[PDB]
Amino acid sequence: HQFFRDMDDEESWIKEKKLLVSSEDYGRDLTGVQNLRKKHKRLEAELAAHEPAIQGVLDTGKKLSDDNTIGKEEIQQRLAQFVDHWKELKQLAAARGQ
């Protein structure tokens, strides 16, 4: 139950993370351009820390499996969303860079 909770709070953080990216943009068109470029740079750094964070949960889940399996499987499905979300985020970041 705890791991699940943590995962949930984590997924939440992901949403909150994306929100930040959406916040650090508004600031007069004239600067908006430089704002996007600056955002990208911060995005790369961010991602560096977001990788280990998300992975951490993933690893934990793997453990749960070996410790239970019957049940945790459902959580994996939910966690699948987490990865998917991050995946999209990565793609977006890549596009921005290019």
Judge contact between 26 and 98, C-beta under 8 A. no
What is the spatial distance between Cα 90 and Cα 47, in angstroms, rounded to a whole number? 8
Judge contact between 82 and 57, C-beta under 8 A. yes
State the virtual CA torsion across 17, 23, 25, 28 in degrees, nearest 10: -170
**Is 76 buried (19+), middle (13-18) or exposed (0-12) by CB count in 10 A?**
middle
Taking the mean position of all CA atoms in its chain, how far away is CA 94?
14
Experimentally determined by: NMR
What angle, 0 to 180 degrees and rounded to 10, lies between the N-to-C axes of helices 2-23 and 72-97?
20
One-character DSSP codes across the chain: -HHHHHHHHHHHHHHHHHHHHHHTT-S-HHHHHHHHHHHHHHHHHHHHHHHHHHHHHHHHHHHHHHHT-TTHHHHHHHHHHHHHHHHHHHHHHHHHH-
- Return the CATH fold of 1-98: Methane Monooxygenase Hydroxylase; Chain G, domain 1 (1.20.58)
Sequence ranges of the domains in the chain: 1-98
